[PDB]
Amino acid sequence: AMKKDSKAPCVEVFDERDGCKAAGTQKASGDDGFCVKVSMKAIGFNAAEAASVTKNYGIKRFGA
Amino acid sequence: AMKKDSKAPCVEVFDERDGCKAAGTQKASGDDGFCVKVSMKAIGFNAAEAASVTKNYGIKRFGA
Amino acid sequence: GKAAYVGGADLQALKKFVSEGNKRMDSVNAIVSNASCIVSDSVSGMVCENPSLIAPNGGVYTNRKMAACLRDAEIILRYVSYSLLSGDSSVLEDRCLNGLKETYASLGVPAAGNARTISIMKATVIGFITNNSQQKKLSTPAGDCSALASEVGGYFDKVSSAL
Amino acid sequence: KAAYVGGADLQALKKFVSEGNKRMDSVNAIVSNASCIVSDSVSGMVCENPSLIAPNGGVYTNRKMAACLRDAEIILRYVSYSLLSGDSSVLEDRCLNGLKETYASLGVPAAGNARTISIMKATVIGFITNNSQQKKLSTPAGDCSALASEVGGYFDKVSSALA
Ligand SMILES: *CCC1=C(C)C(=O)N/C1=C\c1[nH]c(/C=C2\N=C(C[C@H]3NC(=O)C([C@H](*)C)=C3C)C(C)=C2CCC(=O)O)c(CCC(=O)O)c1C
Ligand SMILES: *CCC1=C(C)C(=O)N/C1=C\c1[nH]c(/C=C2\N=C(C[C@H]3NC(=O)C([C@H](*)C)=C3C)C(C)=C2CCC(=O)O)c(CCC(=O)O)c1C
Ligand SMILES: *[C@@H](C)[C@H]1/C(=C/C2=NC(=C\c3[nH]c(C[C@H]4NC(=O)C(C=C)=C4C)c(C)c3CCC(=O)O)/C(CCC(=O)O)=C2C)NC(=O)[C@@H]1C
Ligand SMILES: *[C@@H](C)[C@H]1/C(=C/C2=NC(=C\c3[nH]c(C[C@H]4NC(=O)C(C=C)=C4C)c(C)c3CCC(=O)O)/C(CCC(=O)O)=C2C)NC(=O)[C@@H]1C
Ligand SMILES: *[C@@H](C)[C@H]1/C(=C/C2=NC(=C\c3[nH]c(C[C@H]4NC(=O)C(C=C)=C4C)c(C)c3CCC(=O)O)/C(CCC(=O)O)=C2C)NC(=O)[C@@H]1C
Ligand SMILES: *[C@@H](C)[C@H]1/C(=C/C2=NC(=C\c3[nH]c(C[C@H]4NC(=O)C(C=C)=C4C)c(C)c3CCC(=O)O)/C(CCC(=O)O)=C2C)NC(=O)[C@@H]1C
Ligand SMILES: *[C@H](C)[C@H]1/C(=C/C2=NC(=C\c3[nH]c(C[C@H]4NC(=O)C(C=C)=C4C)c(C)c3CCC(=O)O)/C(CCC(=O)O)=C2C)NC(=O)[C@@H]1C
Ligand SMILES: *[C@H](C)[C@H]1/C(=C/C2=NC(=C\c3[nH]c(C[C@H]4NC(=O)C(C=C)=C4C)c(C)c3CCC(=O)O)/C(CCC(=O)O)=C2C)NC(=O)[C@@H]1C
């Protein structure tokens, strides 16, 4: 059931085939540069983005 | 001197005069709804944004 | 209750188990890498087609109500992004939609507003996956991602129908 | 760690710097749009000189591009802190002191830095003077010409230090 906890699956997709590596981020084993990370996190309120939409909803963007 | 540690002052500005308050955020004394927060944070590398600019630099956005 | 990290042979099996694995990872990446603009453009579109939503005591009048709505749009988008990663809607159905229609009837979250936000999110995601997005294109090998655009379209439709 | 300035603490601060209320809106405009400011300025650098991303150009490969985007944000944030405090002593000491010499070592091209800085400057001033075309600031309407001149001067400080 929908728990009213604001939690959703946050997916991150990594393609590090250029060889560049950040200290501390090797959490899994592989030899191809690919990784997918999934976690459940609470999605938070963003007053700054709320403010921006409230002010700017009437402007068409992105060629949309 | 510039310390080569990527740390910069991250300023946050808060205007909560509508009275909406978040549990666990009264970090200073005041009830007029204004606050400024400053912390020093290492600014991180963003490969996703790097990839996007590499692909999309030639598109004029935002009616620039 | 912890982060799952899938790489190596674990990920190679996942990508064989789902159809069109490599294009599917790119499709997921497009949704999550653009999550903020997808959400903001869709909720903005809700309002500009029906601006009484932001009139006094309207559905997203005041920053708290607008913030709650942007949050919900993101929650829904991310359950859709996970359905596309895994290729089934079990988790979307059971943990996002199940009981959501009834929640929104009590709180006064209007159905016609939600349906427009969802349709715009679907249209925006399909535009990225098909490189019909105009301000940003995906950085992928060129090809046909129409099947995957259709499939993600069905996940969004499941949300629409549920509401 | 974090310092928090509000109430009487903040009320006196808005008193020792000019146009306290417009000033705080101006800072909020920089930090709330930091990502788009940085990405539009580095992108314009490259579209004006696309050899910067050709093989072994200054922002060729994601690492070099990511490092440049990072530096543009670092510089943008030290400028936002200058506008908050009404002086540039922290920018000068912690950001600019030693930076031209570090860049000439690493070969970070001065021409490109100079253009990133000019676009970030034009972008910030555009927001503060209501010349941004996609998004406007959520503020009372009025003239912020003086504060645009001041933040312009801090950007000019960076350009001269790195020229
Ligand atoms: C994530 C932002 C984005 C980038 C970057 C990009 O390149 N494209 C992006 C978004 C995008 N939006 C759409 C489609 C729509 N957006 C809206 C809302 C805006 N239209 C308005 O009238 C309005 C208020 C004035 C807006 C704000 C709408 C209505 C659509 C079409 C949805 C529909 O009719 O069902 C797309 C899809 C491709 C396109 O260009 O339309 C994309 C990629
Ligand atoms: C933060 C993103 C943004 C929003 C949202 C908004 O409403 N305006 C925004 C940005 C913005 N950009 C500028 C000015 C410039 N941007 C560029 C880079 C792009 N020009 C290109 O030719 C190009 C490659 C194809 C780019 C990408 C440039 C060159 C400028 C002009 C800088 C100058 O010297 O004048 C502004 C300022 C106001 C304007 O629209 O020009 C803003 C607000
Ligand atoms: C080199 C500086 C690159 C760059 C690398 C970064 N990766 C970051 C986070 C990260 N990367 C992975 C995938 C990696 N881990 C694995 O186990 C495997 C496969 C087995 C791979 C492909 C993961 C899982 C993560 C998240 C780690 C976590 O969740 O704890 C990263 C972020 C660090 C930061 O936020 O500053 C970086 C910088 N980024 C760049 O721009 C250049 C191109
Ligand atoms: C009600 C749900 C609002 C909303 C509230 C949030 N505020 C968040 C963080 C925050 N707010 C302040 C300012 C406040 N604290 C003070 O001490 C004073 C003045 C003396 C005031 C005006 C601060 C300093 C902070 C940061 C707290 C910290 O340093 O950790 C906040 C968290 C955002 C998030 O977690 O993503 C929220 C949700 N946000 C909304 O959308 C509605 C409109
Ligand atoms: C619609 C989705 C897009 C489009 C996508 C295509 N991607 C193609 C090949 C491809 N993508 C990746 C990266 C992906 N695989 C992973 O495991 C993960 C990270 C965990 C990532 C982000 C790879 C490795 C490949 C194949 C090898 C390569 O060329 O480097 C592709 C070619 C057809 C195919 O492989 O099925 C397409 C069409 N292309 C488009 O034009 C739209 C906008
Ligand atoms: C260029 C900067 C802008 C422009 C800005 C204006 N702001 C004006 C008044 C004003 N702004 C705030 C919020 C601000 N003060 C704070 O303490 C904080 C958070 C710590 C922030 C975000 C307030 C409270 C006020 C007072 C007046 C009111 O509530 O209506 C303003 C009016 C002139 C003046 O007060 O000096 C202006 C012009 N306006 C523009 O058109 C450009 C884009
Ligand atoms: C945006 C397109 C809508 C709109 C959205 C609102 N939702 C509000 C409160 C709310 N939303 C949920 C469901 C959300 N929580 C979850 O855990 C999940 C799935 C895991 C989701 C999809 C809940 C449980 C709640 C109430 C508790 C809470 O807010 O945390 C809301 C505020 C309602 C109120 O103040 O009573 C809004 C405005 N509103 C609109 O008009 C558009 C159409
Ligand atoms: C972007 C507009 C440029 C571009 C920038 C690059 N900078 C690179 C490495 C780098 N940057 C700094 C200074 C930075 N660190 C700090 O602590 C502060 C202020 C407190 C700043 C502004 C340093 C110390 C370094 C080297 C150490 C590090 O990266 O942590 C960089 C990579 C250079 C290399 O790999 O040798 C680039 C590409 N490059 C361009 O072409 C445009 C003009």
Author numbering:
A (entry chain A), B (entry chain F): 1 to 64
C (entry chain B): 14 to 176
D (entry chain D): 15 to 177
Sentences from the paper on this structure:
We show that the cryptophyte Hemiselmis andersenii expresses an energetically complex antenna comprising three distinct spectrotypes of phycobiliprotein, each composed of two αβ protomers but with different quaternary structures arising from a diverse α subunit family. We report crystal structures of the major phycobiliprotein from each spectrotype. We propose that the macromolecular organization of the cryptophyte antenna consists of bulk open and open-braced forms that transfer excitations to photosystems via this bridging closed form phycobiliprotein.
The largest peak of HaPE555 (555 A) is by far the most abundant PBP constituting approximately 63% of the overall protein complement (with other HaPE555 spectrotype peaks contributing 8%). All five crystal forms of protein HaPE555 are constructed from continuous filaments of PBPs, which are organized into two-dimensional rafts. The filaments are generated via knobs-into-holes packing but differ in the distances between adjacent molecules along the filament (having either tight or loose interfaces). It is also possible that the rafts of HaPE555 filaments seen in all crystal forms are part of the organizing principle of the antenna architecture. Thus, HaPE555 and HaPE560 have evolved to capture photons that would be otherwise lost by the integral membrane photosystems: they plug a spectral hole.
